Design a protein around this nucleic acid. Structure first.
Lengths: 35, 93, 201
DNA sequence: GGATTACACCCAAGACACCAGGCACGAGCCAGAAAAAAACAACGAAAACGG
RNA sequence: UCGUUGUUUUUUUCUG
DNA sequence: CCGTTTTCGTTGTTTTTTCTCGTGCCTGGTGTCTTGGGTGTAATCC
């Protein structure tokens, strides 16, 4: 579990649809109405 | 004490017919007596008409026919028209 | 009576303001319609005035900076009215404590209450260094001991009676300090004896 | 057609969904370093001074 | 004569 | 000397009025159903 957590989080640190940190944040919180 | 009358209601009716017309207290009492006696007459007529047909409740038609019986032709017809219009307005709305 | 909150500590000032404005407006066309007002020590921050209409109370408090501006007023019950005006054990030979000066915190026995009733004599335990540091305060007082004529004569004076010695205006009788004490400096109630008192007294 | 059994139906009453505002929270990286600053108003004693 | 203890609280400017 | 007074300690203690993002949670008047009795109607008898 921890290994997956770190392996997924770390790449994000190194970075018309919206992609990148905002998209990941939307996904994680399960935003009901994405941008 | 709480001896209810028809003072303010007669005042309002008077204001809508002759808005700038006053009245004395004894005229108000005369109006109260007239209205009460007419109310008693119409209610008694409705009660007797219900008794004649052996119906234990009162609808508006009993009051309509009582007003027809009590008042003469033209006045009874005008009362019928006003009552019908008021009842229909109270029904639809 | 209505109790309107007033500024902390300035309640007697508010009482004085009420009284003096009542005096000054008397006979005018806008007098203060009040009968009697009071403040009690227990009811600190509470101002009570006798009247019949809240307008009189508002007038009395209006124009005072010594009052909380809020009209945080309330009524008083019939039985409760006397409570607000209800105001509410000192005997020689019983043990009392000191709370003032350099001997504060020492149990003592009353010797004699003045005829007027303003100063109460006590039987304290002397705290004497026998002239080691004469050249005090309530934070440098050394240990306590009964006065000893022999030690007092050896280390450091007048004898008026057998066992009585007058030292620096202080009275030492049977090794116990006698002195005039103000009644405000002492309390006769709310005393729990201490271990040293049990050992000695 | 009055009497008589038959019923049409509807409307006020009452139960419930829900409701969009408002209303609050309540969070918002890691480790490390240094210098620089930190309550006080009034009170009654008690030494103080000239009377 | 072994033993032998040294503040908090904030704010600040910094380092990766 | 001694009564007036600042004074060193003590003792006690509040109030003139003066920017971010989101989910979650918490309210009403509304809205729609449906209930029940009573009025409306007519089918039948004689």
């Amino acid at each position: 579990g921890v290994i997956a957590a770190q392996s997924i989080g770390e790449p994000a640190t190194q970075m018309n649809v919206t992609l990148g940190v905002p998209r990941l944040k939307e996904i994680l919180n399960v935003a009901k109405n994405i941008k | 004490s709480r001896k209810e009358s028809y003072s303010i209601y007669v005042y309002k009716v008077l204001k809508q017919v002759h808005p700038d017309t006053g009245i004395s207290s004894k005229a108000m009492g005369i109006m109260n007596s007239f209205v009460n006696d007419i109310f008693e007459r119409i209610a008694g007529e409705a009660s007797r008409l219900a008794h004649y047909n052996k119906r234990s409740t009162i609808t508006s038609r009993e009051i309509q026919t009582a007003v027809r019986l009590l008042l003469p032709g033209e006045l009874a017809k005008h009362a019928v028209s006003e009552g019908t219009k008021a009842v229909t307005k109270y029904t639809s709305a | 009576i209505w109790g309107v909150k007033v500024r902390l500590g300035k309640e007697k000032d508010v009482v004085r303001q009420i009284l003096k404005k009542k005096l000054a407006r008397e006979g005018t066309k806008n007098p203060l319609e009040i009968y009697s007002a009071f403040q009690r020590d227990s009811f600190k921050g509470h101002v009570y005035i006798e009247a019949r209409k809240a307008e009189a109370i508002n007038d009395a408090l209006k124009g005072n900076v010594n009052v909380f501006s809020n009209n945080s007023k309330f009524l008083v019950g019939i039985v409760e009215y006397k409570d607000l005006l209800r105001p509410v054990k000192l005997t020689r030979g019983s043990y009392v404590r000191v709370k003032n000066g350099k001997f504060k915190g020492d149990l003592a026995q009353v010797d004699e209450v003045l005829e007027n009733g303003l100063e109460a004599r006590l039987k304290l335990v002397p705290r004497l260094d026998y002239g080691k540091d004469l050249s005090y305060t309530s934070k440098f007082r050394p240990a306590q001991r009964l006065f000893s004529e022999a030690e007092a004569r050896v280390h450091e004076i007048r004898r008026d009676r057998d066992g009585f010695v007058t030292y620096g205006g202080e009275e030492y009788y049977e090794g116990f300090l006698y002195k005039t004490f103000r009644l405000q400096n002492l309390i006769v109630n709310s005393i729990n004896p201490t271990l040293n008192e049990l050992s000695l007294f």
